[PDB]
Design an enzyme around this catalytic site. Structure first.
Site, PDB file in Angstrom:
ATOM      1  N   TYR A 133      10.044  68.981 -17.086  1.00 28.16           N
ATOM      2  CA  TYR A 133       8.909  69.758 -16.609  1.00 28.16           C
ATOM      3  C   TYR A 133       7.650  68.902 -16.731  1.00 28.16           C
ATOM      4  O   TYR A 133       7.132  68.692 -17.825  1.00 28.16           O
ATOM      5  CB  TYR A 133       8.817  71.026 -17.457  1.00 28.16           C
ATOM      6  CG  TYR A 133       7.564  71.853 -17.298  1.00 28.16           C
ATOM      7  CD1 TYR A 133       7.275  72.513 -16.108  1.00 28.16           C
ATOM      8  CD2 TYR A 133       6.704  72.039 -18.379  1.00 28.16           C
ATOM      9  CE1 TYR A 133       6.170  73.340 -16.001  1.00 28.16           C
ATOM     10  CE2 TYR A 133       5.599  72.861 -18.283  1.00 28.16           C
ATOM     11  CZ  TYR A 133       5.335  73.514 -17.093  1.00 28.16           C
ATOM     12  OH  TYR A 133       4.234  74.350 -17.029  1.00 28.16           O
ATOM     13  N   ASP A 218      13.234  75.123 -25.153  1.00 28.79           N
ATOM     14  CA  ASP A 218      12.449  75.901 -24.207  1.00 28.79           C
ATOM     15  C   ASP A 218      13.462  76.574 -23.274  1.00 28.79           C
ATOM     16  O   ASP A 218      13.821  76.022 -22.233  1.00 28.79           O
ATOM     17  CB  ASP A 218      11.541  74.937 -23.439  1.00 28.79           C
ATOM     18  CG  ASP A 218      10.558  75.638 -22.528  1.00 28.79           C
ATOM     19  OD1 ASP A 218      10.976  76.488 -21.706  1.00 28.79           O
ATOM     20  OD2 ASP A 218       9.355  75.312 -22.622  1.00 28.79           O
ATOM     21  N   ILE A 220      13.202  79.115 -21.290  1.00 28.76           N
ATOM     22  CA  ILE A 220      12.450  80.001 -20.421  1.00 28.76           C
ATOM     23  C   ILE A 220      13.188  80.492 -19.183  1.00 28.76           C
ATOM     24  O   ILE A 220      12.797  81.492 -18.590  1.00 28.76           O
ATOM     25  CB  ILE A 220      11.140  79.333 -19.994  1.00 28.76           C
ATOM     26  CG1 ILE A 220      10.256  80.340 -19.248  1.00 28.76           C
ATOM     27  CG2 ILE A 220      11.450  78.104 -19.165  1.00 28.76           C
ATOM     28  CD1 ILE A 220       8.886  79.810 -18.847  1.00 28.76           C
ATOM     29  N   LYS A 259       9.183  83.136 -15.773  1.00 36.33           N
ATOM     30  CA  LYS A 259      10.189  82.741 -14.801  1.00 36.33           C
ATOM     31  C   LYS A 259      11.336  83.725 -14.603  1.00 36.33           C
ATOM     32  O   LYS A 259      11.770  83.928 -13.475  1.00 36.33           O
ATOM     33  CB  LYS A 259      10.743  81.356 -15.151  1.00 36.33           C
ATOM     34  CG  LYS A 259       9.682  80.270 -15.233  1.00 36.33           C
ATOM     35  CD  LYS A 259       9.188  79.803 -13.875  1.00 36.33           C
ATOM     36  CE  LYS A 259       8.049  78.790 -14.026  1.00 36.33           C
ATOM     37  NZ  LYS A 259       8.174  78.046 -15.277  1.00 36.33           N
TER      38      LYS A 259
HETATM   39  C1  LIG Z   1       7.226  77.261 -15.719  1.00 36.38           C
HETATM   40  C2  LIG Z   1       7.458  76.543 -17.033  1.00 36.38           C
HETATM   41  C3  LIG Z   1       6.552  76.689 -18.118  1.00 36.38           C
HETATM   42  C4  LIG Z   1       5.302  77.562 -17.997  1.00 36.38           C
HETATM   43  O1  LIG Z   1       5.506  78.787 -18.713  1.00 36.38           O
HETATM   44  P1  LIG Z   1       4.203  79.728 -18.662  1.00 36.38           P
HETATM   45  O2  LIG Z   1       4.515  81.034 -19.290  1.00 36.38           O
HETATM   46  O3  LIG Z   1       3.798  79.954 -17.246  1.00 36.38           O
HETATM   47  O4  LIG Z   1       3.085  79.091 -19.410  1.00 36.38           O
HETATM   48  C5  LIG Z   1       6.820  76.013 -19.328  1.00 36.38           C
HETATM   49  N1  LIG Z   1       7.931  75.234 -19.455  1.00 36.38           N
HETATM   50  C6  LIG Z   1       8.808  75.075 -18.429  1.00 36.38           C
HETATM   51  C7  LIG Z   1      10.030  74.195 -18.622  1.00 36.38           C
HETATM   52  C8  LIG Z   1       8.592  75.728 -17.196  1.00 36.38           C
HETATM   53  O5  LIG Z   1       9.485  75.556 -16.158  1.00 36.38           O
HETATM   54  N1  LIG Z   2       2.902  71.817 -13.739  1.00 39.78           N
HETATM   55  C1  LIG Z   2       1.589  72.367 -14.081  1.00 39.78           C
HETATM   56  C2  LIG Z   2       1.766  73.760 -14.725  1.00 39.78           C
HETATM   57  O1  LIG Z   2       1.967  74.730 -13.704  1.00 39.78           O
HETATM   58  C3  LIG Z   2       3.078  75.548 -14.025  1.00 39.78           C
HETATM   59  C4  LIG Z   2       4.332  75.360 -13.348  1.00 39.78           C
HETATM   60  C5  LIG Z   2       4.642  76.120 -12.064  1.00 39.78           C
HETATM   61  N2  LIG Z   2       5.382  77.341 -12.388  1.00 39.78           N
HETATM   62  C6  LIG Z   2       5.483  75.235 -11.130  1.00 39.78           C
HETATM   63  O2  LIG Z   2       6.713  75.337 -11.107  1.00 39.78           O
HETATM   64  O3  LIG Z   2       4.903  74.290 -10.436  1.00 39.78           O
END
Ligand SMILES: *Cc1c(COP(=O)(O)O)cnc(C)c1O
Ligand SMILES: NCCOCC[C@H](N)C(=O)O
Ligand SMILES: *Cc1c(COP(=O)(O)O)cnc(C)c1O
Ligand SMILES: NCCOCC[C@H](N)C(=O)O
Lengths: 419, 419
Positions: A133, A218, A220, A259
């Protein structure tokens, strides 16, 4: 006379800008750029919209004074509980989460930054498999002074983590006299959209534990799994017979609702640490990014409705899978192969054969054709620190069926007219 | 093997604990401890509760998908605008706020921490008049590595800031070879509950500007003023003739809705910097503490209703004043004098004559009688780094008339039975 941070702050934003500039719309801008770069989850909102209508009591005192004036950082007792169960549920109730440990944070962004603050001093390091990420480079370093060391991953073994590659990155860093405080994984994986294998997790939690360094996970995308194998949470790896002796002070989970519920705008980030001291320090730090009581209220309500939660997790997975396969199949028509995956809100597509060469220059060249001439905003492997050119992440959970088909035709067109 | 921050983390919490233990309640616990230590604003919630009922369209898509999926860090365009006007309004529309500059943060707690990140490196320093908001010791230093230097204030000149005391603290620090990056004020003042004088502000903005250091102003109590003089915001000091040549890159405002609207639980913190670079860096950092879109929506709605906003600011001030005077008068019956004040949600009471001596030991001794024997939870001057014993902050905006009268009797009783 600003601070170092201020006085020290856009090439990978070409795709994002191309879209904002010429945004696709069926009627208004039909030849516009289709957004396939953002990882949003909307194939379920109708499920959440619905719930809200038939339940006009999950907000604004349905007790307004109470939630409005409430400012304790353990958050609403019932909010914690509903978050803890929603989590047990996502891992097939195969594990238990004590809501007394649930700590808040500014979405996963603040979760990841806060945990690093708790596990590393300025200059320390963290290992992280690539690709990863991209925001990590900010979330994990910017204000923490902590640096990131990449664990290399390639297409051969389908981008898996190997004890070789880990000890490789690890030992290498030691030579340079760099102190490594931990390792952070993403499972399900981003941008791979792959749920890590059970044994693979074990190996890593082993290496981690055998060198007394932390393992931040993580998870998520835990509730975006749409195909076997089933998601193995780190909480489950710990309740296993052979893992009984690992130190729980080194293991921590990072979660969010952004997500797998499509609520990135509610900023619901969670930190579930198996370490009591970290839980403490993490909570005291949550007063910098507490979830709004107004939002804690609404979620305690909706996430307490088992019927809804069971339907969602099930219903949602059914659509994600439907969508994914439909997209993959279309791509294999024109002969485009993707990395087999069972989670996430995207797919790791392989365009290596379209590259004029095996260089990032070519990858960037091709990418320009896609954002400008094929008019689809997608992310290139280099954005995720992928160490091998030719891969692109393509998000398919933020639009409807018709739009998914236009993009496919566009790709079908571009490919045909290229051989 | 945690980080320094974690591996390094309760005497002033005796009052707070005494209450939680034996919480006052008219029927249930009539001889319970009355909460007068927390600075909450509830003399107006009925005004906000009301608005919500007659307006069933200021929440949850009254556009749910949009607000839920919205994740840009400039926040909702209309949210910014309503916050900018609510601010102009609080300063009697005597100044203009461009909502394009409005940046978010985790309530004032994240606002103050974020701004320090933008104006000072680990080790740098900030000047701050004492007494001050105790959480500053955490909010401004903990994760910023920035240290605080106190500007001494005493009861003689009623706790005002003097060029003498400022240059005193300032120069002193230089000897110790400490780099001072700025000065942070609180206006209206906490715990003094006093709105700083116009010329006084000027002097400070002068000293600040004459040494190219920042002036951070936490005007979180801006809308709690209930008596003349009228609140002079730093924004107004800058639109003045003699101040035209001050550098706006050194001036910044810190705001929140937690005190003048009674919504600490919504975590609405704002940073309004006259410095474009700071505005930038501050916004990029807001993605660690963004206000919930769900909450941004509700506030954009309510704060856009001029009629409501005009009534509130007016109505609210009327009650705060009513309450304050009623409390002060009662105290002067038994001969207790307070520091004259025209803002805040408390008063700076003087119990120096009740001290057995002019030592903090005595102050702590007396305080114990108040939290245990007089059963009222109040804050002692030492908690705010007050450098002279005998002062206590007593909050009067979180309870109803009847409760305010019981406390008064309790104090009347204790005093009588002491001479
Ligand atoms: C989208 C994403 C985040 C952001 O999470 P938020 O709740 O929007 O701050 C963090 N880590 C990963 C790996 C992601 O894909
Ligand atoms: N990469 C910067 C942080 O923005 C959040 C991520 C967003 N959900 C995405 O997938 O681009
Ligand atoms: C109450 C208070 C704060 C806290 O603001 P929040 O929005 O609750 O974070 C910050 N500064 C001062 C001076 C306060 O009195
Ligand atoms: N002092 C710790 C931070 O808590 C916030 C302040 C609270 N509103 C109070 O007045 O005690």
């Amino acid at each position: 006379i600003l601070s170092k941070l201020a006085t020290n702050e856009s090439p990978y934003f070409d795709g994002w800008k191309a879209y904002d500039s010429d945004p696709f719309h069926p009627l208004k801008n039909p030849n516009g750029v289709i957004q396939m770069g953002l990882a949003e989850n909307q194939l379920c909102l109708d499920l959440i919209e619905d719930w809200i209508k038939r339940n006009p009591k999950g907000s604004i005192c349905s007790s307004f004074k109470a939630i409005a004036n409430f400012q304790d950082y353990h958050g609403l007792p019932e909010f914690r509980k509903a978050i803890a169960k929603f989590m047990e549920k996502t891992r097939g109730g195969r594990v238990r989460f004590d809501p007394e440990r649930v700590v808040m944070a500014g979405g996963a962004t603040g979760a990841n930054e806060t945990i690093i603050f708790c596990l590393a001093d300025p200059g320390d390091a963290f290992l992280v498999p690539s690709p990863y990420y991209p925001a990590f480079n900010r979330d994990l370093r910017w204000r923490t002074g902590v640096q990131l060391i990449p664990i290399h991953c390639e297409s051969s073994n389908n981008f898996k983590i190997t004890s070789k590659a880990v000890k490789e990155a690890y030992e290498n860093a030691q030579k340079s006299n760099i102190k490594v405080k931990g390792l952070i994984l993403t499972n399900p994986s981003n941008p791979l959209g792959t749920t890590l294998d059970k044994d693979t997790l074990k190996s890593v939690l082993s290496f981690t534990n055998q060198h007394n360094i932390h393992l931040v996970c993580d998870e998520i995308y835990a509730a975006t799994v749409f195909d076997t194998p089933q998601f193995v949470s780190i909480a489950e790896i710990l309740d296993e017979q052979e893992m009984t002796y690992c130190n729980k002070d080194l293991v921590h989970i990072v979660y969010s609702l952004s997500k797998d519920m499509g609520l990135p705008g509610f900023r619901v980030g969670i930190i579930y640490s198996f370490n009591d001291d970290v839980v403490n320090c993490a909570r005291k730090m949550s007063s910098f990014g507490l979830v709004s009581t107004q939002t804690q209220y609404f979620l305690a309500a909706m996430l307490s409705d088992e019927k809804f939660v069971d339907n969602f997790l099930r219903e949602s997975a059914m659509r994600l899978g439907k969508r994914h396969k439909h997209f993959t199949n279309g791509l294999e028509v024109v002969g485009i192969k993707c990395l087999k995956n069972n989670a996430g809100l995207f797919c790791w597509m392989d365009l290596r054969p379209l590259l004029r060469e095996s260089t990032f220059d070519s990858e960037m060249s091709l990418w320009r054709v896609i954002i400008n001439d094929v008019k689809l905003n997608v992310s290139p492997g280099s954005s995720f620190e992928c160490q091998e050119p030719g891969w692109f992440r393509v998000c398919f959970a933020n639009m409807d069926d018709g739009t998914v088909d236009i993009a496919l035709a566009r790709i079908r067109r571009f490919v045909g007219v290229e051989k």
